[PDB]
Structure 1
Amino acid sequence: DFTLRNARMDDIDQIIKINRLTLPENYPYYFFVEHLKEYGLAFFVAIVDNSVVGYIMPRIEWGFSNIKQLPSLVRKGHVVSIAVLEEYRRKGIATTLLEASMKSMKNDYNAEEIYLEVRVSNYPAIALYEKLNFKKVKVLKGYYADGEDAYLMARPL
């Protein structure tokens, strides 16, 4: 079994470890710290027996909607990074991390939409998001450093 709670400064070391092991976008320590201090209410970790096994790091924005056809200014929640240690996958951790972050984006930060970028090859992640009713709304060409395309996936809150 796992539990969720908001991330704390003392979680950052384990979060970075997870990020280093599971993702190619290896942000520096100060990046994690600033997102925790600025958007901490929507920054969650998953815990198994006192260890962090997953996390979701958000960014809160104000700007043009990426869902609406017309230029329209909205509050947006942006998933910067989400990862779960391999041993603890297929347990619903990412699903519950996203739900918790979404609820805070909506209630704490008045977000009207949530969105993220995902590698077009990232089959597990895409399945996750489509199950949570994210839609592929844009294709960011050459979004990743190696040139790989991203789907911009989004949904209203």
Structure 2
Amino acid sequence: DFTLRNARMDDIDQIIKINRLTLPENYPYYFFVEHLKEYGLAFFVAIVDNSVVGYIMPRIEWGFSNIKQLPSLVRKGHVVSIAVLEEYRRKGIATTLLEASMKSMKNDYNAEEIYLEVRVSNYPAIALYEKLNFKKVKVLKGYYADGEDAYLMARPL
């Protein structure tokens, strides 16, 4: 079984190794630290036997909505990064990480929408997001360094 709690500074090293094992977008140590410092309340880790086995890293923004059609300014939650170690997948961890972060984005940061980018090839991630009622808003052509497209996926809070 797993539990969830807010990320702390001491977790960063484990988070980074998870990032590097599971994702190609490998952010530097200081990048993790700044997100923890500025958006900590919405930054969670999943824990098994006092080891970190997954995390979600958020960013809180203010700007044009990508749900509304003509220009409207809103507070937005952005999922910068989420990952769960291979051995611990299909247990609801990502789902609960997203729920916790969304609730914080709404209650702590007054966000009224959450969005993210996902590789169009990333079948498991897209499945998860759609189950949580994210909608594909647009395709960000060539969004990744290799040229791969991303879906921008979003939902209101």
Separation in 1 of the partners of 2:105 and 2:80?
A: 13
1:113 CA displacement? 0.1
Task: Give the CA RMSD over aligned residues.
Answer: 0.2
Secondary structure of 1:110's partner? coil
Aligned residues: 157
Residues 85-129 of structure 1: per-residue CA shift (max 9 Å, x gap): 000000000000000000000000000000000000000000000
- SS of 1:144's partner is coil
Q: TM-score, normalised by structure 2?
A: 1.00
Other structure's SS at 1:32 match = helix
Post-superposition Cα deviations, 1:20-49, rounded to whole Å, max 9, x if no partner, equal: 000000000000000000000000000000
Render the CA deviation track for 1:110-154: whole Å, top value 9, x for unaligned. Answer: 000000000000000000000000000011010000000000000
Secondary structure at 1:82 match in 2 = strand
Runs of 5+ unmatched residues, structure 2: none
- Give the distance between the partners of 1:70 and 1:112, measured in 2 at CA: 17
Q: State the alpha-carbon separation in 1 of the partners of residues 138 and 33 from structure 2.
A: 29
- Using the size of structure 1 for normalisation, the TM-score is 1.00
What does 1:72-151 correspond to in 2, within 5 Å? 72-151=72-151
User: What's the offset of the Cα at 1:56?
Assistant: 0.1
1:49-70, CA deviations, whole angstroms, 9 ceiling, x for partnerless residues?
A: 0000000000000000000001
Runs of 4+ in 1 over 2 A off after TM superposition: none
